Amino acid sequence: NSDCPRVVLPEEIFFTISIVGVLENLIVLLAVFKNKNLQAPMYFFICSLAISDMLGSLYKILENILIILRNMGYLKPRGSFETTADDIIDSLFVLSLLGSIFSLSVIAADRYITIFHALRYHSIVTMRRTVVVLTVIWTFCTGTGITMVIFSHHVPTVITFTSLFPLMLVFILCLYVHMFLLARSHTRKISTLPRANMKGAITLTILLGVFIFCWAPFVLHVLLMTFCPSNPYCACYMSLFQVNGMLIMCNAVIDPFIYAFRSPELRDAFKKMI
Amino acid sequence: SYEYYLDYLDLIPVDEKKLKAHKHSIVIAFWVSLAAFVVLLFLILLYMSWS
Protein backbone atom coordinates (compact mmCIF):
# COMPACT_ATOMS: atom_id res chain seq x y z
CA ASN A 1 0.00 0.00 0.00
CA SER A 2 2.42 2.68 -1.27
CA ASP A 3 1.60 6.30 -1.87
CA CYS A 4 1.97 5.76 -5.65
CA PRO A 5 -0.08 2.69 -6.60
CA ARG A 6 0.54 1.34 -10.09
CA VAL A 7 -2.26 3.08 -11.98
CA VAL A 8 -4.37 0.48 -13.79
CA LEU A 9 -6.41 1.87 -16.65
CA PRO A 10 -9.74 0.26 -17.58
CA GLU A 11 -9.41 -2.09 -20.52
CA GLU A 12 -12.16 -0.01 -22.14
CA ILE A 13 -9.80 2.92 -22.78
CA PHE A 14 -7.23 0.65 -24.44
CA PHE A 15 -9.88 -1.06 -26.55
CA THR A 16 -11.48 2.21 -27.64
CA ILE A 17 -8.20 3.88 -28.58
CA SER A 18 -6.98 0.81 -30.46
CA ILE A 19 -10.27 0.39 -32.35
CA VAL A 20 -10.39 4.08 -33.29
CA GLY A 21 -6.80 3.94 -34.50
CA VAL A 22 -7.37 0.78 -36.53
CA LEU A 23 -10.50 2.17 -38.19
CA GLU A 24 -8.98 5.59 -38.88
CA ASN A 25 -5.73 4.31 -40.36
CA LEU A 26 -7.83 1.80 -42.31
CA ILE A 27 -9.81 4.58 -44.00
CA VAL A 28 -6.51 6.40 -44.58
CA LEU A 29 -5.11 3.32 -46.32
CA LEU A 30 -8.32 2.77 -48.29
CA ALA A 31 -8.27 6.35 -49.58
CA VAL A 32 -5.03 5.23 -51.19
CA PHE A 33 -5.26 2.19 -53.51
CA LYS A 34 -8.91 3.12 -54.20
CA ASN A 35 -7.92 6.48 -55.62
CA LYS A 36 -5.12 5.84 -58.07
CA ASN A 37 -4.99 9.61 -58.27
CA LEU A 38 -3.41 9.55 -54.83
CA GLN A 39 -0.30 7.57 -55.73
CA ALA A 40 2.54 10.07 -55.30
CA PRO A 41 5.48 9.14 -53.05
CA MET A 42 4.31 11.50 -50.30
CA TYR A 43 1.03 9.64 -49.93
CA PHE A 44 2.92 6.34 -49.84
CA PHE A 45 5.01 7.66 -46.95
CA ILE A 46 1.79 8.73 -45.24
CA CYS A 47 0.53 5.21 -45.92
CA SER A 48 3.63 3.81 -44.21
CA LEU A 49 2.87 5.97 -41.18
CA ALA A 50 -0.73 4.73 -41.24
CA ILE A 51 0.45 1.12 -41.42
CA SER A 52 2.68 1.73 -38.40
CA ASP A 53 -0.26 3.18 -36.46
CA MET A 54 -2.48 0.28 -37.51
CA LEU A 55 0.15 -2.22 -36.39
CA GLY A 56 0.41 -0.50 -33.01
CA SER A 57 -3.32 -0.51 -32.38
CA LEU A 58 -3.56 -4.09 -33.65
CA TYR A 59 -0.78 -5.00 -31.24
CA LYS A 60 -2.93 -3.56 -28.49
CA ILE A 61 -5.97 -5.51 -29.52
CA LEU A 62 -3.93 -8.72 -29.54
CA GLU A 63 -2.25 -7.93 -26.22
CA ASN A 64 -5.59 -7.26 -24.54
CA ILE A 65 -7.01 -10.47 -26.02
CA LEU A 66 -4.02 -12.47 -24.79
CA ILE A 67 -4.19 -10.87 -21.34
CA ILE A 68 -7.92 -11.57 -20.98
CA LEU A 69 -7.00 -15.08 -22.13
CA ARG A 70 -4.27 -15.63 -19.53
CA ASN A 71 -6.70 -14.14 -17.08
CA MET A 72 -9.73 -16.47 -17.11
CA GLY A 73 -7.11 -19.18 -17.59
CA TYR A 74 -7.47 -20.21 -21.23
CA LEU A 75 -3.66 -19.99 -21.40
CA LYS A 76 -1.23 -21.36 -18.85
CA PRO A 77 -0.04 -18.64 -16.43
CA ARG A 78 3.58 -19.20 -17.51
CA GLY A 79 5.69 -21.10 -20.01
CA SER A 80 6.44 -20.92 -23.71
CA PHE A 81 2.67 -20.68 -24.19
CA GLU A 82 2.80 -17.11 -22.80
CA THR A 83 6.39 -15.83 -22.79
CA THR A 84 7.05 -16.36 -26.50
CA ALA A 85 3.63 -14.93 -27.31
CA ASP A 86 4.51 -11.84 -25.29
CA ASP A 87 7.82 -11.63 -27.13
CA ILE A 88 6.22 -11.77 -30.58
CA ILE A 89 3.38 -9.34 -29.75
CA ASP A 90 5.62 -6.82 -28.08
CA SER A 91 7.89 -7.18 -31.11
CA LEU A 92 4.92 -6.07 -33.18
CA PHE A 93 4.64 -3.13 -30.77
CA VAL A 94 8.29 -2.08 -30.95
CA LEU A 95 8.43 -2.37 -34.73
CA SER A 96 5.22 -0.33 -34.92
CA LEU A 97 6.80 2.43 -32.84
CA LEU A 98 10.03 2.43 -34.85
CA GLY A 99 8.09 2.39 -38.10
CA SER A 100 6.08 5.36 -36.89
CA ILE A 101 9.19 7.34 -36.00
CA PHE A 102 10.94 6.56 -39.29
CA SER A 103 7.72 7.24 -41.22
CA LEU A 104 7.53 10.70 -39.65
CA SER A 105 11.20 11.20 -40.48
CA VAL A 106 10.79 10.19 -44.13
CA ILE A 107 7.68 12.36 -44.44
CA ALA A 108 9.82 15.25 -43.23
CA ALA A 109 12.57 14.30 -45.68
CA ASP A 110 10.13 14.10 -48.59
CA ARG A 111 8.73 17.50 -47.67
CA TYR A 112 12.26 18.90 -47.48
CA ILE A 113 13.05 17.51 -50.92
CA THR A 114 9.82 18.91 -52.36
CA ILE A 115 10.57 22.39 -51.03
CA PHE A 116 14.35 22.70 -51.32
CA HIS A 117 14.58 20.52 -54.45
CA ALA A 118 11.25 21.46 -56.01
CA LEU A 119 12.20 21.56 -59.68
CA ARG A 120 14.03 18.23 -59.43
CA TYR A 121 11.86 16.46 -56.84
CA HIS A 122 10.27 13.87 -59.12
CA SER A 123 13.72 12.96 -60.44
CA ILE A 124 14.95 12.49 -56.86
CA VAL A 125 11.94 10.84 -55.20
CA THR A 126 10.71 8.32 -57.75
CA MET A 127 8.39 5.39 -57.18
CA ARG A 128 11.38 3.06 -57.43
CA ARG A 129 13.20 4.96 -54.68
CA THR A 130 9.91 5.25 -52.79
CA VAL A 131 9.55 1.48 -52.68
CA VAL A 132 13.23 0.78 -52.00
CA VAL A 133 13.45 3.27 -49.13
CA LEU A 134 10.16 2.11 -47.60
CA THR A 135 11.30 -1.52 -47.81
CA VAL A 136 14.69 -0.73 -46.28
CA ILE A 137 13.18 1.28 -43.45
CA TRP A 138 10.53 -1.33 -42.63
CA THR A 139 13.08 -4.15 -42.83
CA PHE A 140 15.30 -2.23 -40.42
CA CYS A 141 12.26 -1.58 -38.23
CA THR A 142 11.27 -5.25 -38.00
CA GLY A 143 14.86 -6.43 -37.58
CA THR A 144 15.61 -4.11 -34.69
CA GLY A 145 12.17 -4.78 -33.24
CA ILE A 146 13.16 -8.43 -33.04
CA THR A 147 16.53 -7.38 -31.65
CA MET A 148 15.06 -5.04 -29.03
CA VAL A 149 12.32 -7.42 -27.90
CA ILE A 150 14.46 -10.52 -27.56
CA PHE A 151 17.55 -8.60 -26.38
CA SER A 152 15.26 -6.08 -24.71
CA HIS A 153 16.17 -5.39 -21.10
CA HIS A 154 19.89 -4.88 -21.72
CA VAL A 155 21.20 -1.38 -21.09
CA PRO A 156 22.53 -0.68 -24.63
CA THR A 157 19.17 -1.68 -26.11
CA VAL A 158 17.44 0.90 -23.93
CA ILE A 159 20.12 3.42 -24.84
CA THR A 160 19.60 2.94 -28.58
CA PHE A 161 15.79 2.90 -28.50
CA THR A 162 15.81 5.99 -26.27
CA SER A 163 18.29 7.78 -28.53
CA LEU A 164 16.24 7.16 -31.66
CA PHE A 165 13.72 9.63 -30.20
CA PRO A 166 15.87 12.76 -29.66
CA LEU A 167 18.05 12.21 -32.72
CA MET A 168 15.11 11.78 -35.09
CA LEU A 169 13.36 14.68 -33.34
CA VAL A 170 16.33 16.97 -34.00
CA PHE A 171 16.37 15.70 -37.59
CA ILE A 172 12.68 16.56 -37.99
CA LEU A 173 13.38 19.97 -36.45
CA CYS A 174 16.35 20.66 -38.71
CA LEU A 175 14.07 19.92 -41.66
CA TYR A 176 10.85 21.67 -40.63
CA VAL A 177 12.54 24.78 -39.23
CA HIS A 178 14.48 25.18 -42.47
CA MET A 179 11.23 24.89 -44.41
CA PHE A 180 9.71 27.47 -42.05
CA LEU A 181 12.60 29.86 -42.69
CA LEU A 182 12.10 29.42 -46.43
CA ALA A 183 8.40 30.17 -45.93
CA ARG A 184 9.43 33.32 -44.08
CA SER A 185 11.63 34.28 -47.02
CA HIS A 186 8.67 33.84 -49.36
CA THR A 187 6.43 35.86 -47.03
CA ARG A 188 8.96 38.69 -47.33
CA LYS A 189 8.33 38.83 -51.08
CA ILE A 190 4.60 38.05 -51.04
CA SER A 191 3.58 41.14 -49.05
CA THR A 192 5.25 44.27 -47.73
CA LEU A 193 4.05 44.04 -44.13
CA PRO A 194 6.00 41.95 -41.61
CA ARG A 195 3.01 39.62 -41.30
CA ALA A 196 4.52 37.00 -39.02
CA ASN A 197 2.74 33.86 -40.19
CA MET A 198 0.70 31.78 -37.74
CA LYS A 199 -0.33 28.68 -39.69
CA GLY A 200 3.32 27.74 -40.19
CA ALA A 201 4.28 28.11 -36.54
CA ILE A 202 1.01 26.52 -35.42
CA THR A 203 1.56 23.65 -37.86
CA LEU A 204 5.11 22.92 -36.75
CA THR A 205 4.07 23.25 -33.11
CA ILE A 206 1.19 20.80 -33.59
CA LEU A 207 3.38 18.28 -35.39
CA LEU A 208 6.27 18.41 -32.93
CA GLY A 209 4.01 18.54 -29.87
CA VAL A 210 2.07 15.50 -31.02
CA PHE A 211 5.38 13.75 -31.64
CA ILE A 212 6.83 14.70 -28.25
CA PHE A 213 3.78 14.43 -26.00
CA CYS A 214 3.11 11.01 -27.56
CA TRP A 215 6.68 9.75 -27.21
CA ALA A 216 8.48 11.68 -24.48
CA PRO A 217 6.55 10.14 -21.54
CA PHE A 218 7.24 6.57 -22.67
CA VAL A 219 10.90 7.32 -23.37
CA LEU A 220 11.27 8.89 -19.93
CA HIS A 221 9.62 5.87 -18.32
CA VAL A 222 11.98 3.49 -20.12
CA LEU A 223 15.02 5.56 -19.16
CA LEU A 224 14.00 5.74 -15.50
CA MET A 225 13.23 2.01 -15.39
CA THR A 226 16.65 1.23 -16.83
CA PHE A 227 18.95 3.60 -14.96
CA CYS A 228 17.12 4.30 -11.74
CA PRO A 229 14.47 1.83 -10.53
CA SER A 230 15.35 2.59 -6.89
CA ASN A 231 14.75 6.32 -6.44
CA PRO A 232 11.30 6.95 -4.89
CA TYR A 233 10.43 9.83 -7.23
CA CYS A 234 11.38 7.70 -10.22
CA ALA A 235 9.24 4.87 -8.96
CA CYS A 236 6.31 7.33 -8.71
CA TYR A 237 6.88 8.25 -12.34
CA MET A 238 6.96 4.58 -13.33
CA SER A 239 3.63 4.13 -11.55
CA LEU A 240 2.10 6.05 -14.49
CA PHE A 241 3.29 3.60 -17.15
CA GLN A 242 -0.16 2.79 -18.50
CA VAL A 243 -0.97 6.48 -18.97
CA ASN A 244 2.29 6.94 -20.87
CA GLY A 245 1.33 3.96 -23.02
CA MET A 246 -2.05 5.54 -23.72
CA LEU A 247 -0.07 8.60 -24.81
CA ILE A 248 2.27 6.60 -27.06
CA MET A 249 -0.98 5.26 -28.57
CA CYS A 250 -2.85 8.55 -29.03
CA ASN A 251 -0.22 9.07 -31.74
CA ALA A 252 -1.98 6.49 -33.89
CA VAL A 253 -5.29 8.32 -33.48
CA ILE A 254 -3.83 11.82 -33.82
CA ASP A 255 -1.30 11.04 -36.57
CA PRO A 256 -3.77 10.92 -39.49
CA PHE A 257 -5.41 14.19 -38.40
CA ILE A 258 -2.03 15.93 -38.78
CA TYR A 259 -0.43 14.21 -41.79
CA ALA A 260 -3.15 12.53 -43.86
CA PHE A 261 -6.37 14.53 -43.64
CA ARG A 262 -4.72 17.95 -43.92
CA SER A 263 -4.21 17.06 -47.58
CA PRO A 264 -7.41 18.14 -49.39
CA GLU A 265 -7.15 15.25 -51.84
CA LEU A 266 -7.26 12.70 -49.03
CA ARG A 267 -10.33 14.44 -47.60
CA ASP A 268 -11.96 14.18 -51.03
CA ALA A 269 -11.05 10.49 -51.26
CA PHE A 270 -12.66 9.86 -47.88
CA LYS A 271 -15.74 11.79 -48.99
CA LYS A 272 -16.14 9.55 -51.98
CA MET A 273 -15.64 6.57 -49.82
CA ILE A 274 -18.75 7.70 -47.96
CA SER B 1 13.38 -23.07 -3.33
CA TYR B 2 14.07 -20.50 -6.03
CA GLU B 3 17.52 -19.11 -6.85
CA TYR B 4 18.88 -16.70 -9.47
CA TYR B 5 15.27 -16.14 -10.55
CA LEU B 6 15.27 -13.26 -13.02
CA ASP B 7 11.82 -11.68 -13.23
CA TYR B 8 9.98 -8.38 -13.54
CA LEU B 9 10.63 -6.54 -10.28
CA ASP B 10 7.64 -4.75 -8.77
CA LEU B 11 7.56 -1.03 -8.09
CA ILE B 12 9.30 -0.13 -4.84
CA PRO B 13 6.75 0.84 -2.14
CA VAL B 14 7.45 4.57 -2.14
CA ASP B 15 6.11 6.34 0.96
CA GLU B 16 5.40 10.04 0.44
CA LYS B 17 6.05 10.98 4.07
CA LYS B 18 9.76 10.19 3.82
CA LEU B 19 10.06 12.00 0.48
CA LYS B 20 11.30 15.58 0.69
CA ALA B 21 10.05 16.87 -2.66
CA HIS B 22 6.58 16.05 -3.93
CA LYS B 23 6.13 12.44 -4.94
CA HIS B 24 5.24 13.42 -8.47
CA SER B 25 8.27 15.68 -8.89
CA ILE B 26 9.39 13.98 -12.09
CA VAL B 27 5.91 14.00 -13.64
CA ILE B 28 5.24 17.68 -12.95
CA ALA B 29 8.77 18.73 -13.89
CA PHE B 30 8.76 16.78 -17.16
CA TRP B 31 5.32 17.92 -18.27
CA VAL B 32 6.00 21.56 -17.37
CA SER B 33 9.25 21.22 -19.33
CA LEU B 34 7.43 19.73 -22.33
CA ALA B 35 4.76 22.43 -22.32
CA ALA B 36 7.53 25.01 -22.03
CA PHE B 37 9.37 23.41 -24.95
CA VAL B 38 6.24 23.50 -27.11
CA VAL B 39 5.53 27.12 -26.18
CA LEU B 40 9.17 28.04 -26.78
CA LEU B 41 9.05 26.47 -30.24
CA PHE B 42 5.86 28.38 -31.02
CA LEU B 43 7.25 31.68 -29.76
CA ILE B 44 10.67 31.31 -31.40
CA LEU B 45 9.04 30.39 -34.72
CA LEU B 46 6.69 33.38 -34.43
CA TYR B 47 9.60 35.70 -33.63
CA MET B 48 11.67 34.37 -36.53
CA SER B 49 8.71 34.90 -38.87
CA TRP B 50 8.25 38.41 -37.46
CA SER B 51 11.96 39.27 -37.51
Binding site: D86, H153 | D7, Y8
Partner: peptide
Protein backbone atom coordinates in the same frame (compact mmCIF):
# COMPACT_ATOMS: atom_id res chain seq x y z
CA UNK C 1 9.69 -12.14 -21.66
CA UNK C 2 8.64 -13.17 -18.17
CA UNK C 3 4.95 -12.19 -18.29
CA UNK C 4 2.34 -10.49 -20.44
CA UNK C 5 2.56 -6.78 -19.68
CA UNK C 6 0.50 -4.26 -21.61
CA UNK C 7 3.66 -2.90 -23.25
CA UNK C 8 7.40 -3.54 -23.15
CA UNK C 9 9.88 -2.05 -20.69
CA UNK C 10 7.10 -1.73 -18.13
CA UNK C 11 9.15 -2.96 -15.17
CA UNK C 12 12.85 -3.63 -14.56
CA UNK C 13 14.56 -7.01 -14.55
CA UNK C 14 16.46 -8.12 -11.46
CA UNK C 15 17.14 -11.31 -9.48
CA UNK C 16 13.92 -12.15 -7.62
CA UNK C 17 15.42 -15.30 -6.11
CA UNK C 18 13.37 -17.03 -3.42
Amino acid sequence: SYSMEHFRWGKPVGKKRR
